[model samples]
Target: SGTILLDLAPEDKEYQSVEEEMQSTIREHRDGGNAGGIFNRYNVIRIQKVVNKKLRERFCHRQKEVSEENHNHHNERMLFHGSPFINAIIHKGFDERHAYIGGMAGIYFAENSSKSNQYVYGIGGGTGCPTHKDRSCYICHRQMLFCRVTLGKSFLQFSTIKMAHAPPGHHSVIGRPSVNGLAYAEYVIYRGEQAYPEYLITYQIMKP
Candidate 1:
């Protein structure tokens, strides 16, 4: 297969952040940031463990192993995966769960008012949570960021449960929408790849 490139104008509708994040995701012959496959493959139990463990320095709020002077930020490269088989490897196989099928995975980045980094997105996927059981994940930021949306709970309850309200002194994270599902199509994106960001911003506003 040939690799395609897409550029997204900031003003574009969807922001393609979903696909950008997806592209960032590690997989068979894919590319992204400075690191990939540093963590274990997909699996809910694995995903939880990785996140809790700070598998990646940035994701865990720690300094990367290497120095900025040693690495090139522009035109830098790493591998990413886009298929279900690979997706399963990254998140501890959340996709393996019957309740998690048709869900999506992507990185999520948001800035606090002060830009203190609400936390740059490392990786996140979409899945369901029952209302009677877990309530938070059932109803908010289902993709990554402040996740924990209880799937079958109040569709309305998802508005802002997991994410902490923007702190008084800081600007809420800026970049893309708080992810909820997957990007099922393909396109050019201004920020990441293809129309991914352009499409994601549009779809999020539409609110299916």
Candidate 2:
């Protein structure tokens, strides 16, 4: 199924506002749905999974320089060539509860508890709090089935965030139309096995 592809990096860096990010998440979802019916066939997409077992358990080490000028400069957006390899299921929204518990579980494993906040941005269930009512949630932060990886001198980092579903209230991780159909986004976060090398966020934890 055809899907949307975008790029993010140090240039795209900005104040990580939960609200603004949530809005952008919703907008992209709507836009993706309109791209065509190509993403409406697959069910129970494995999405993306941890490709590097060693890195998945790795911890953050001497990361690339993080500066104000570099944060903006470091965060860039560059279109990448397509591949027969794509991950759509992991990027789409899933049930609210699933997104929550699932995200927390994954983040905890990655030990990025500080980035533990989830924005329940997408709507696909009953109802919930302000941040999650068609807003943002835990899964919104961790559900990057499709991620990009890059190499750093000492670590790997993820340069982009794929896509994910943000169903409101409680939800499931599987069997949803969004999950079943071929509707999702890819991610690009260069990671590493030792000390999380590369531009990817050194972690096998991006995916389950």
Candidate 3:
């Protein structure tokens, strides 16, 4: 018997129903002939839940800083570490739906939102807009995930999206880490946890 893992749902018990139904339906549609093989393997991935503490701690570290006078303002590319670097421009193609630029010109945040447009950006000025605080859009805005990296005092942010199959780790505390764009990247599986999964995909809910 082979083992499979699903990195979905934070609340295991609560999401059991949705998980089963969703997985079965997807497998059946994709491989109707091997529909029976769906349950033969065991992992069901849940929607990733971001760990605010991890991101907060990561962002608080020293950030990168660069000046436009020494760099090209038109293209926004700068020489970072002896390499021609493209500053992460969270700005997108579809009416800037992909990401939001921070208050200061240098900062950026890559985002993930639903089809209903729950996390759309607002005008450049206003109460809740990213520009509420001067050069504080990275800390001001909430809602979507923003994977960040710092190289001095400058912050570069971007989203590494994954479609089809789950990233490794079960019952994961998801963090939006910036990653390189990939079509078929590989996982190294360096470390693992102690509690191995067991049974009818067991579910346990605890008290606060």
CA lDDT, every model vs. true structure: 0.22, 0.22, 0.23
lDDT of 2 by residue, 1-208 (tens): 2223232332333312222332233222433332111121111112222233333333222123321223322332211111111132222211123324433211111111111111211222224223434222222222212222221211222322222421232111112124445233322222121122112111111111
Q: What tens-digit string does per-residue lDDT give for candidate 3 at 134-171? A: 21132232222212222211212233322222233221
Off by over 4 Å in 2: 1-58, 61-126, 130-181, 186-208
What are the TM-scores, per candidate, against the unseen true structure? 0.18, 0.20, 0.17
Number of the candidate with higher lDDT, 1 or 2: 2
Error in Å for residue 167 of model 2: 28
Candidate 1, residues 77-100, lDDT tens digits: the string is: 211222223223333322213222
Instruction: Name the TM-score of candidate 2.
Output: 0.20
* C-alpha RMSD of each candidate structure in angstroms: 20.4, 18.1, 22.2
